[PDB]
């Protein structure tokens, strides 16, 4: 509360560390469904159904331009990419399996780097 604070965690490396995670997600062989925004002119139903589209290139631009106020807002966007994927794609599909694989990959890096 006022004048009562927990000891100050060193957050000075968070930006660099989120960048490194994102590089590792970008270079994963199963990243291909997530690298660029879904083309809303060419994929029927996507625009109406997915209220907040997110992809790796859009996260990279937000990260590089100071649009994440903290490491939690960063994780929320990465998770959004996989939540969108599950919303639109059957589990038994190449893209559906890609999303589950990438979510696991992310969550382990996230825990190992920050928890």
CATH architectural name: Up-down Bundle
- The total count of helices amounts to 5
Alpha-carbon Rg, integer = 16 Å
Strand content: under 5%
CATH H-level homologous superfamily name: Bromodomain-like
Distance between the termini: 24 Å
Reading the helices and strands in chain order gives HHHHH
Overall form: elongated
Structural class: mainly alpha
What is the name of the CATH topology? Histone Acetyltransferase, Chain A
Number of DSSP strands? 0
Helix percent band? 55-70%
Largest beta-sheet characterization: none
Tally of separate domains: 1
Mind telling me the CATH class?
Mainly Alpha
Describe this structure in words.
This protein has 115 residues and is mainly α. The chain has one domain: Histone Acetyltransferase, Chain A, CATH 1.20.920.10. Helix content is 57%, strand content 0%. The chain contains five helices and no strands. It has helices at 14-26, 46-49, 56-64, 71-88, 94-114. The longest helix is centred in the last third of the chain and has 21 residues, at 94-114. This is Bromodomain adjacent to zinc finger domain protein 2B. It is found in: Nucleus. Belongs to the WAL family. Residues 9-113 form the Bromo domain.
């Amino acid at each position: 509360s006022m004048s009562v604070k927990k000891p100050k965690r060193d957050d000075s490396k968070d930006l660099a560390l989120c960048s490194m995670i994102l590089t590792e997600m970008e270079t994963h062989e199963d990243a291909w469904p997530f690298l660029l925004p879904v083309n809303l002119k060419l994929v029927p139903g996507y625009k109406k159904v997915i209220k907040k589209p997110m992809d790796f290139s859009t996260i990279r631009e937000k990260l590089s331009s100071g649009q994440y106020p903290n490491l939690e807002t960063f994780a929320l966007d990465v998770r959004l990419v996989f939540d969108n994927c599950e919303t639109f794609n059957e589990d038994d599909s190449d893209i559906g399996r890609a999303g589950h694989n990438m979510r696991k990959y992310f969550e382990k890096k996230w825990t190992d780097t920050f928890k």
